[PDB]
Amino acid sequence: DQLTEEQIAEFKEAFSLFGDGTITTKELGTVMRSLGQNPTEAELQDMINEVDANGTIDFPEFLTMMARKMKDSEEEIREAFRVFDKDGNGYISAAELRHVMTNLGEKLTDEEVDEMIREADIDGDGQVNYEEFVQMMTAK
Amino acid sequence: GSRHRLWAVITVQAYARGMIARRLHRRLRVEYQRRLEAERMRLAEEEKLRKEMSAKKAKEEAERKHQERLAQLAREDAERELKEKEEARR
Known part of the structure; x- marks a missing residue:
């Protein structure tokens, strides 16, 4: 299923609090959990190796990360x-x-x-x- | 029994980091709403200052335009004074 406009809006609020317009990999952990997630740092490093070479994650990438982890x-x-x-x-x-x-x-x-x-x-x-x-x- | 205990320490550790973050989120969210309403004050009083300046400009122009109109009416009265003097000649 695809993320509703309510969810995407909630996600943009979280992402925006972390003026770069993209979030760091260190903050990435904290942003995912702040949206109800509870992953361990092991699960995080796998996902960060999946989409970095860059060094950061922006909201569309972050949404795909919020789609990847569920x-x-x-x-x-x-x-x-x-x-x-x-x-x-x-x-x-x-x-x-x-x-x-x-x-x-x-x-x-x-x-x-x-x-x-x-x-x-x-x-x-x-x-x-x-x-x-x-x-x-x-x-x- | 040993591996499930390590699954347990990591599980509590992961759920731990989630609560800390949501606490922080609440703090960031409240901090933003706080600074915003205060900034809403900070901008509303900026708009009010512009309004006060507009009133001052309106007062300054009122006396200028009012005095300019009196320049014409003072001319009229002095002109009538001489015409009456010219009428006093004949």
């Missing part, structure tokens, strides 16, 4: 978080999560986890429930 949910991140509730109690240590993200898997910066944990700070009891996160992460 999400077919909340259960996938719940189950991914379930791997963190070692007790299966439905809760996860904030400190433990911080150690996981920064040093294991996709290395998040101290900035990035701080922003994730910034709102989490209201939650922080040393340990934190992930249901506040699943709701915050899903919301646009």
Whole structure:
């Protein structure tokens, strides 16, 4: 199916916030997610190698990138978080999560986890429930 | 059990970056709307200043044109003064 005028308009709004008239590859990640997407940086490098030699992406190219990548949910991140509730109690240590993200898997910066944990700070009891996160992460 | 845990750390990491971006988006979007309405003030008061200048130009021309018309009517009165003097001759 083809992107409706409503979608193309929403996409132009995102793209325009990032006066070049084309967005960088580094910003490309942030622009796709800002439009509801949640890809990993692995998935990104494949798509950026597909259309660069240039160095950037403009809105038409970006729309084809938004056509290339498409999400077919909340259960996938719940189950991914379930791997963190070692007790299966439905809760996860904030400190433990911080150690996981920064040093294991996709290395998040101290900035990035701080922003994730910034709102989490209201939650922080040393340990934190992930249901506040699943709701915050899903919301646009 | 080990590979699904790595699928889990990357999954949470990817969903993490999405929320951060949408937060940032909300911040950028609100920042733009903020600067815009303020700029809407900044331009409306620019149009008002032009209006005040137009009124001042209208006031300046009013006295100029009004005084120019009085030049003719003062001529008329002085001319009548001499004609009455010439009528006083005969």
